[PDB]
Amino acid sequence: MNIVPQDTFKSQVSTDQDKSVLSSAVPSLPDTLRQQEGGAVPLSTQLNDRHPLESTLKNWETTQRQRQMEQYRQIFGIAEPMKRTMEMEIVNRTDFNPLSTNGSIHRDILLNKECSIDWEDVYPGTMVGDDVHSKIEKQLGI
Amino acid sequence: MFRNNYDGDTVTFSPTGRLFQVEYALEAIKQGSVTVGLRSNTHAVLVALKRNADELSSYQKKIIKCDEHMGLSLAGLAPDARVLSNYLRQQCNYSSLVFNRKLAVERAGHLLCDKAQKNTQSYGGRPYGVGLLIIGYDKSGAHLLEFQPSGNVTELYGTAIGARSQGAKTYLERTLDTFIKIDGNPDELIKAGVEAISQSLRDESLTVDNLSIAIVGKDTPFTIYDGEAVAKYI
Amino acid sequence: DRYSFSLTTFSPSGKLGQIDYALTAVKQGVTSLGIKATNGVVIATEKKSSSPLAMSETLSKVSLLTPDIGAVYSGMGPDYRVLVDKSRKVAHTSYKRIYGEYPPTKLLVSEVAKIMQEATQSGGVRPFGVSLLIAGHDEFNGFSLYQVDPSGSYFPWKATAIGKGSVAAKTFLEKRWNDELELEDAIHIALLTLKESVEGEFNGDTIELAIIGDENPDLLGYTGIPTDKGPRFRKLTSQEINDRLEA
Amino acid sequence: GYDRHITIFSPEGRLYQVEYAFKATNQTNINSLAVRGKDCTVVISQKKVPDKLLDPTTVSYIFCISRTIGMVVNGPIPDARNAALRAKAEAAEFRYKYGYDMPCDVLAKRMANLSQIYTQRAYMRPLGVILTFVSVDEELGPSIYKTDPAGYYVGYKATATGPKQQEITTNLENHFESWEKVVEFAITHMIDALGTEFSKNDLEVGVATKDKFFTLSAENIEERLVAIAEQ
Amino acid sequence: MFLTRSEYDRGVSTFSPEGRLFQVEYSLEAIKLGSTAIGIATKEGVVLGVEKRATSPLLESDSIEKIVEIDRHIGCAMSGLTADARSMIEHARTAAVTHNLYYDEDINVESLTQSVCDLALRFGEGRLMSRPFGVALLIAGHDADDGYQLFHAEPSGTFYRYNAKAIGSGSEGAQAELLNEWHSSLTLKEAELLVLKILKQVMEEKLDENNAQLSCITKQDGFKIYDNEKTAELIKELKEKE
Amino acid sequence: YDRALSIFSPDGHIFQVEYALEAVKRGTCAVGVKGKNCVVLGCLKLQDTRISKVSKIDSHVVLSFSGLNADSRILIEKARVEAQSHRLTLEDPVTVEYLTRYVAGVQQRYTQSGGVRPFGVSTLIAGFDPRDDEPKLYQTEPSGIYSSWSAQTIGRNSKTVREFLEKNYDRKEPPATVEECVKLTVRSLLEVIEITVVKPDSDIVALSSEEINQYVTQIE
Amino acid sequence: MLFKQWNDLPEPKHLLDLPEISKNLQSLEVCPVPKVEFPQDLDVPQYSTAVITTKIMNPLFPKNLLQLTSIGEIKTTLVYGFSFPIYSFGKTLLFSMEENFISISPIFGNMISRSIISQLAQFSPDIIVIGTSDKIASMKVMTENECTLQPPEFITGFIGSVLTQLIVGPSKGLKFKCLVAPSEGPNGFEKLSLSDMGSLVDLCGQWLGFEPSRYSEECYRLWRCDSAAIGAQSGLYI
Amino acid sequence: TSIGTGYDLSNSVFSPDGRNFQVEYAVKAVENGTTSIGIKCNDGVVFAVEKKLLVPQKNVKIQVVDRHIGCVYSGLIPDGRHLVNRGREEAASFKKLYKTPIPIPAFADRLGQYVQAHTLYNSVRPFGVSTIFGGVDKNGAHLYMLEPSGSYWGYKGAATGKGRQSAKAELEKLVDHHPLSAREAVKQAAKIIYLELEISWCSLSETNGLHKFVKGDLLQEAIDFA
Amino acid sequence: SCLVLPLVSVGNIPQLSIDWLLNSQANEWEYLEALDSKYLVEFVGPLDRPEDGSDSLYKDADMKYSSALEVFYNKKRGLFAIQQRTPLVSVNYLNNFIVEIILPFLSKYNISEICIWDSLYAMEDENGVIVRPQEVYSLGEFYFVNNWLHFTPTSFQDKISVDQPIFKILFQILPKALRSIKYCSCLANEGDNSLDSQQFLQWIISQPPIVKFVRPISWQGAYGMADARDKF
């Protein structure tokens, strides 16, 4: 029942925490070529002195959604959040589109964002691993 | 015939309400080898006829141990038996770690019931197709639970599961009046169990390799007797 | 379950079945039409109602997308409504929020076509069973009229009609269209075409008509920014439509 | 083919699965009426309870969705209750986000867009209910909006729904100070159309007033029927 | 009473009317497609041997690799869909090395084959894989707990301790003759010659150091695969037994 | 039982992988021959010639293919990315066995879901390990099986060209000179020209379309 | 799984997956029928008995216990050209059809059963039939004096062809005792439970005249070490 | 037509008549279950059912979901168990939140929503159980029967299972006779079942508003009446 | 004299309709003869009999078994019915089956009409022969894609499809006793077609009424024998 996102920092770190981008030669270290982040130089240890807002703004909507589901569990019972979540997962799992960045037209309706803009809408923001095949493999878990 | 249409998944009922796909998992127990369980008020005993695939092979481990208080017997699908045993033992452990209390046998059985029910209603998985007998001893005394992979759990004085379990269960039904009083003399309860499992045998006899026994009670943590330790009871 | 097979697929003929069936659903829809004049565009359609107790003032078949752009459809009204909502949202998000100005009609039509096309690739949804006539003005491209089909194909038209009357309306337009029409001439030709296409009662309450024209500062809602531009989209009132019908 | 099991187009261009979701709405034989006064909206439904064992206290197809919005559902009660909870959560979310009470037609639009989702996703069935929302809007006044399984919605001066809805609609077309008179009017026309002299428990009645929506109690329907029988 | 198609065998989750998961049966049939492997346990060591089947004489028999090291005292012979065998062997090797790292102790062969079968479970609940593996593994090793021991790992996720086991094509005949000819006193040298004899019985091509290789486990020496020279010498000694 | 990767045939076959091997059987023919000192690979009017089917994956290792061209191009791109990723994470250039193992793993990975098509391509991988001079030649298959070969042929005519190689190759008198390997390759192809010669220390030459070997073999 | 695939509609079940004889479908021509040759030099009259089985049943006939002599092969032509051996032992002839749902279209088995029964109706020896059916719920004994099949149960596959020709057709009245074990799986890939295997040996050894203890033990070896019928059931079930 | 071939092999399909045949088949599953009745008193409700190595003090069919509310189901054991446990979770969460026994209509609503949700998607099947539940309440006492469709209504009496038709007929005659005390209703429930016995009741006067089992003396007296 | 011939078609509706006919009129029908199973999948089963307990259709003492293919004859009506318990091994052998089973039977009993009973799976209409699909039933006839058979109004078929019916009527048109062909087709779906087959037989009889439909006792095993287990 949260307003501001509370749980917002990684409790555990490992060289293998980042999956789908691991070295095939040594399955314990990142693949810095496939990361395309500018080398290893973005070492995971450099995840320090993050902007105080960032860790809350990234996951603000997730927290609002979790509060909403909690409210529906408290007032309507376990059936309503279950129904909402099942609908949402059906939408997310059936919309596959490797070329479009745009959000699903039905996802916005379910989220009740048909008449809402946010900066993530206005500002929706590579030699390796950008290919359609990398998206296929991520989505199917190949 | 028409059963062929309505039996493809756990998610279609037939025009008669059968839910055949669960029935087939309950028939999957009949392919298992016989095991017997029985208890008195102070002690609980499991007896199992193990099998081996070939004369060059060892006998398969049919009985297990959740903890020092409760244990389990398997019949049916080995993969599902593995899953459920790991599940029952991870619950026994979590219970001990968080509360430092022996998980009540009845509670453990209800946890199995719940886990088993899920696979009966979602499309993608399948029913566990394995029956389990749970015995234990706690504050409430000796317990024997029969688990069916439909997600049904019953507390019993004795039962049998597997291919010819009907013989042993008929024998026990004639004799429950005798074994439930066997308190503080567990050797006689073990011998009664081996007698009960001496019915339902076919072309076979009980031997220190093919027969396995375990016991638990007020004075006796869960112990398994197999091999030369069984010769005392054959 | 990580994948859903594509619901739209090519037939051995090379034709995408669901696209053909969506175009058939369009052919089944009530007639709508549009006409470029030299100084405006007309879009018009029948307000078919399931009852006389329905409030025709709520049967908004013609809808504003931008002050300079409007749309009409034939086919599945719910799909049109969802497409209108999304097209408005994309007109703001993709363009007005970046460049500070409303998109040109060509680019909003392209965005709608992109949205409609992707429903033809997805394995979760059917294509939309509607085609849209989108009329608008741009400072550089001028007045323009596009027809968007369930495939997400679009073409610019001088005049067109869709739905049951589509072929007969397109022939009446092809004989009656000329490069010199004034907006009042285009409105008259539109009304005559719809009178010829409509079924049953033809009155100002069974029709609605919108125009793209000159700016309407009396629709701007504020005064005193002289460079600021009133909407060019204007729906005609049923009073005005009846006053046209008395011509 | 698949067009029979899922909501894809048939070669005719028809979504058979949605048309069949319309036929689900008449599987209950209840029919209902909504009418507008000058300053109130009234909805009349049948309450068919022939089963001696069934408790008619609980048998209601009229739902109070908001302080100012009510709806009657035609179609199976499980999907009606689902739609009710959905609309009620959406009205509360709208009030939370925009700071004013949701208009009846905006709730109708929201529920119609949800029904469009269910008409367009392959793996979601349409909901199988027709929803009639009634309210007194603070801008539009008394208004009635009805929503179909297809996700079509339109406003109405009056409505009927159910197997005999044509008879009531035609009676209303034949026709076309306080809400009690409007209730009595609607009941009288229901009687005249259907030919059944209602018992006090053969009916349920909802009233939207300027301030609130409420359902009549059996003693209020009783006194309305008495006031009818006086004429 | 009419003959109609029954589809109970066309899906891994589907039970047959009597409760069989027929896709596991067909996985075992896919293993019966695989080339023969032979294993014989003895109180002195475990011997493994495989039919190096060759599609063509241009195939380099020195790279068929039907027997692999999992750990210093544990080896494994493959049969069946080699891709799945590769996946299981990579898993087993990872398990073994991890157990060494975390317990300062080489894995018990029983615990290793348990881990391998735990992998083979994951076509169902522990899902990871679209289908069961089409491969049986025959895991032989030595440990201080139980000594020389041989295990057969089925794609069903069950393992059995065996004295001797044949897998792959001809495994019915090979197993029947192992059952006739195996005995508890068999010394390692004659167990090697028995393995070779059984292979000659079940291999359709003439047994040759280019189409067979042998291996044994021996605590003085760990796992090893014999060179072609010693394999040829043993084949000559077998022909001298004839 | 034909219509998914997940389904075993009652006789234990996965037909959907055999159909990908039949898809390979339709691709244009590729030939490979190991010598003692080299490995040799070989295979309309308005085509723009300036814009070979033999693709360098790294300076020391080369991949040919047969089957679907686009699939082959995707798998080549992935192999190149892996070669450079290894060369970055570890200082040594990839082993040729490591590269072919990776390629076969990728082909297998696209077999591990019914929602993805397996690559309908077989690859012929030829080269030399860094600081080594044993010639290595490998085949990969749609199943992700891989094997080492002294010579192999894949695609449209692989049957006859392989039956030729099975008699004109000698496992214990292999061609001991570059010209002898090129001769044997061209002969095998002439049973049905492009030739590439790979040599130790990252030396690779597309052999200039020298018809001399063709004329000599036609004289023979 | 979150959803069932929309594309996975039930495939129609009135059609069987039996292997088609002509990839040239729409032949509109009368197709050839498998020609069979029985080995005409066989002195069949010297055997008192014939045992007719599907090769699944081979574990019931332990070669080293019976001294199962090999005999000439039955040949067929249609080119497919399938063939399978005859065997004989103990004054008894034996037929083991290599039934295969995927390869040998049952028309071959039909014609082979015609050839066998038409060769064997003359000088008629006693017929023992051992076979499989998935529709029977338990092991059944069947003979001219009593059909133990319940109205839902029936027999099909090559053993059904044998029984058909034994009962009614171009030959009639040939006395037999038929034993069918309950099975599951397609023709050529049937599986049997250990209860079935045990009852089947415990009965066929009594009919066929073997020393029951040693015969039982040898058959148990032939079943367990490996067999087509045991399959995974030694490892799939505890 | 009761079969509906071609519209039955998948959940959530509407047939051309708007019927969900998988739901009708889950109803037909209920028609196989142990005959079970419930009766609503003036003051409360009572439930009864028609039902050797089992431990007899553990072989009980009526499920207390909460002290506030009693529950009995017929149809698929595992589905019944699951729905019962889901209801016990919903009751416990309501009690934790609002510090009051869950109103019987709110509980009924939550269960109907949970069952109904299983009718929406092809990835799940309807529950094969019809449940009769009820109890004393802030507003009196309520008796509900929850069908596998998720349809539910209040009842003065309800019966499910193979004997449901005769039980319904006799319970309707009973209602026609009393247009009941807890004692009388217990006796009539025993009779209707007889037309092993196990009974439980919930009344403000005779169980303090808790749900309690009818056992020992009063059970034997009810059997004597039957 | 007349013959009916049930095709092995979607839902087995023809064969189920024949079982309906035989077991409802079981006093009028009797078994005559087996027909050569050569081209059919072999089949041996017990004698089926009416579930009402009326006299069995089989009349002999030592007939303990039933053939894959059997002929019944209505003594009162000159009417014959083939029952086919198994499909053809090959659809290509459909020609051989017609030429070697049917014509020698039609001649042996001078049969003047053969009624081919069929069911079409609506999804398999790749040819587009379905018209007015709101019609569940179709009757084609002939008297001594292709348009050889003439379809009545209220038939869902405009034309014959390239399927078992075209093969049969082709190899029939390509004995002098035979005078007309009838082709009854049901637009059908998979599942328990017991009721759908009953209604198809009703429609055939509409276009000798049946006083009461009776199942064969064999259909009592169509869903297994019992629940017999501790889970309702």
Task: Write structural notes for this entry.
This is part of a larger assembly, with 9 protein chains of 9 kinds. Chain C is an alpha+beta fold. Chain C has one domain: Glutamine Phosphoribosylpyrophosphate, subunit 1, domain 1 (4-Layer Sandwich). In chain C, about 35% of the residues lie in helices and about 20% in strands. In chain C, a hairpin with a 4-residue loop joins β1 (about 30-35) and β2 (about 40-45). Chain C is globular, with a radius of gyration of 18 Å. By secondary structure, chain F is an alpha+beta fold. Chain F has one domain (about 1-220): Glutamine Phosphoribosylpyrophosphate, subunit 1, domain 1. The longest helix of chain F is centred in the middle third of the chain and has 21 residues, at about 70-90. Chain H has about 230 residues and is of the alpha+beta class. Chain H has one domain (about 5-225): 4-Layer Sandwich (Glutamine Phosphoribosylpyrophosphate, subunit 1, domain 1). Chain H has helices spanning about 20-30, 75-100, 105-115, 165-175, 180-195, 215-225; strands at about 35-40, 45-50, 65, 70-75, 130-135, 140-145, 150-155, 155-160, 195-205, 210-215. In chain H, the strands form 2 sheets. Chain H has a 5-stranded antiparallel beta sheet. Chain H is globular. Chain H starts with 20 loop residues before the first helix and ends with a helix. Chain I has an 8-stranded mixed beta sheet, covered by helices on one side. Chain I has a two-stranded antiparallel sheet with strand order 3-4. In chain I, a hairpin with a 6-residue loop joins β8 and β9. The longest helix of chain I has 16 residues, at about 95-110. The chains are: A mainly alpha (about 140), B alpha+beta (about 230), C alpha+beta (about 250), D alpha+beta (about 230), E alpha+beta (about 240), F alpha+beta (about 220), G alpha/beta (about 240), H alpha+beta (about 230), I alpha/beta (about 230). Chain H: It is found in: Cytoplasm; Nucleus. Chain H: Keywords: Acetylation, Cytoplasm, Nucleus, Proteasome. Chain H: GO terms for molecular function: mRNA binding. Chain H: This is Probable proteasome subunit alpha type-7.
Number of helices of chain E: 6
Cα shape of chain E: globular
CATH class of chain E: Alpha Beta
The most extensive contact between chains is:
G-I, 48 and 49 residues
Order of helices and strands of chain E: HEEEEHHEEEEHHEEH
Shape designation of chain H? globular
Helix-strand topology string of chain H: HEEEEHHEEEEHHEEH
CATH-wise, what's the superfamily of chain H? Answer: Aminohydrolase, N-terminal nucleophile (Ntn) domain
Strand segment count of chain H: 10
**Spatial arrangement of strands, main beta sheet of chain E:** 8-1-2-9-10
Task: Indicate the structural class of chain E.
Answer: alpha+beta
Number of helices of chain H: 6
Tell me the β content of chain E.
Answer: 15-25%
Distance between the termini of chain E: 59 Å
- Supply the number of structural domains of chain E: 1
What is the CATH architecture descriptor of chain H?
Answer: 4-Layer Sandwich
Using only C-alpha atoms, the radius of gyration of chain H works out to 18 Å
